[PDB]
């Protein structure tokens, strides 16, 4: 029976497809590890897939996955129990150390480039022709933290050129220096920009960019991780 053969064959195919999909999804994060960083005994029934190499744009090199995994950064956490499966307590200030929801990844310390070789993200003042086309322009507005105290003022919008979208708001602090705030973590209001994630006193701690006109992937992660971490770690001040 043709139909019986077809359905029988389809299930064989589907199993093979699921096998393919699961292994393809093991190109990051595997092999699994014990809490101490050593290889876990049980890796599961799916083996690591054969490595594949991505040729990065603009001669940035290549990425081969699966590949040697490592955090490449100190992780300030310590066990809270004598057996596996329990939380690991921050050994210092989690927001400063970058752990828990304040975590960041040691990404490449270079700015992402668009298909034309120019920095993908740029402060609007340096993005020729870019301007606020709709909605409340946040530039010039005071920035309030969850402690209801003013933490600074918006001095610019950082735009993702290819997507023509706002990624960050640049905020100048009382000391004159600035910090970037993820657009997704601020609320633009008629008279101000409110940041629920951070109290005014934590703005100075937001990781700074080394060059005022650009932001690297590494800096992006440190900035976004720090702000997001505030939801949990700044709760006492909220």
């Amino acid at each position: 029976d043709l139909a019986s053969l077809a359905i029988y064959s389809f299930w064989i195919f589907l199993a093979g497809l699921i096998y393919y999909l699961q292994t393809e999804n093991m190109r990051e994060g595997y092999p699994l590890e014990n809490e101490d960083g050593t290889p876990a005994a049980n890796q599961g029934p799916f083996p690591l897939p054969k490595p594949k190499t991505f040729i990065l744009p603009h001669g940035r090199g290549t990425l081969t996955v699966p590949g040697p995994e490592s955090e490449d950064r100190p992780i300030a956490l310590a066990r809270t129990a004598v057996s596996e499966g329990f939380p690991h307590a921050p050994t210092g200030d989690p927001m400063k150390d970058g752990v828990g929801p304040a975590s960041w990844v040691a990404r490449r310390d270079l700015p992402e480039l668009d298909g034309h070789g120019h920095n993908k993200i740029k402060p609007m003042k340096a993005a020729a022709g870019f301007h606020v086309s709709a909605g409340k322009n946040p530039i010039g507005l005071p920035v309030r933290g969850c402690d209801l105290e003013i933490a600074g003022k918006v001095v610019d919008i950082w735009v993702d050129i290819p997507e023509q979208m706002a990624r960050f708001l640049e905020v100048e602090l009382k000391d004159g220096s600035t910090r970037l705030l993820p657009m997704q973590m601020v609320k633009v209001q008629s008279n101000r920009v409110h940041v629920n994630a951070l109290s005014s006193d934590l703005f100075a701690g937001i990781p700074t960019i080394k060059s005022p006109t650009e932001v690297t992937l590494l800096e992006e992660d440190k900035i976004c991780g720090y702000v997001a971490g505030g939801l949990m770690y700044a709760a006492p001040k909220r």
Binding site: P57, P87, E163
Partner: protein, 281 residues
């Protein structure tokens, strides 16, 4: 076992209930109070299904079917073997689903991410509840709910649909289907676009979001953008389910006749109702 980059995220906190009492993991799974709740509800529901199977006289996965109380019972209780088990299992299911969503919320809090996922899941839960709770209650009997059986619930869909003629004529159902088809279309396109850029022709450098924008603008004259496509997929999927729940909540309540006849309100508009010619004249 943990993913190579996982330990830094396994910190204390984020729980909604119980403090640190259930703040831990079992293998890859996070537990939490709602993990315990989900396990309880799921285990009990599964045990009761197995018991319903015994009362039914079969262990065949294809035959096991738990039915809600017959219409005679209205919205009241019923003997375990005559609809009572379905009632309890339904409570367990609801408890397990809601607990699952709340567990996701705790996970969101520990990871410092948005709550979009459980919010989205809540739509599926509300669709389920529309069929086993809201619609049955509005109609006056648990018997209008679908049975828990692999094939028997399909009998219910078929029988329920034909109760109103060809169910295709339910206007809310048409909208729901449009969103389901459009969603699958958008999902295929999204997956294909990202992959076509990450996996260009052999030997070439990975393509960029600019290439993604360019491909679709060249193709159809528009590119919704990366943020836009994920907002779209979420909206299409949730809209499909919203209209699904809507098409059923109005069926057997505000509208109970043949759905095809509903469309006469349009054909009967005074300004063209009696104009000769066409299909309806």
């Amino acid at each position: 076992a943990l993913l190579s980059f996982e330990r830094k995220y396994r910190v204390p906190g984020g729980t909604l209930v119980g403090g640190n009492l259930f703040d831990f993991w079992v293998g890859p799974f996070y537990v939490g109070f709602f993990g315990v709740a989900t396990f309880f509800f799921a285990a009990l529901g599964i045990i009761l299904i197995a018991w319903s199977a015994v009362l039914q006289g079969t262990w065949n996965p294809q035959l096991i079917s738990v039915y809600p109380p017959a219409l005679e019972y209205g919205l009241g209780g019923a003997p375990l073997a005559k609809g009572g088990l379905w009632q309890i299992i339904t409570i367990c299911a609801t408890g397990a689903f809601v607990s699952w969503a709340l567990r996701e919320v705790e996970i969101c809090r520990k990871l410092g991410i948005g709550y979009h996922i459980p919010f989205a899941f809540a739509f599926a839960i509300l669709a389920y509840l529309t069929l086993v709770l809201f619609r049955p209650v509005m109609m006056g009997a648990w018997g209008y709910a679908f049975p828990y059986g692999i094939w028997t619930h399909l009998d219910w869909v078929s029988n329920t649909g034909y109760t109103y003629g060809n169910f295709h004529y339910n206007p809310a159902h048409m909208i729901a289907i449009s969103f389901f088809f459009t969603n699958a279309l958008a999902l295929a396109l999204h997956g294909a676009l990202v992959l076509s850029a990450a996996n260009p022709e052999k030997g070439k450098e990975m393509r960029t979001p600019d290439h993604e924008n360019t491909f679709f603008r060249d193709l159809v004259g528009y590119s919704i953008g990366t943020l836009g496509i994920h907002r779209l997929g979420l909206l299409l999927s949730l809209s499909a389910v919203f209209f699904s729940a809507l098409c059923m909540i109005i069926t057997g309540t505000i509208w109970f006749d043949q759905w095809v006849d509903w469309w006469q309100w349009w054909v009967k508009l005074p300004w063209w109702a009696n104009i000769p010619g066409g299909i309806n004249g």
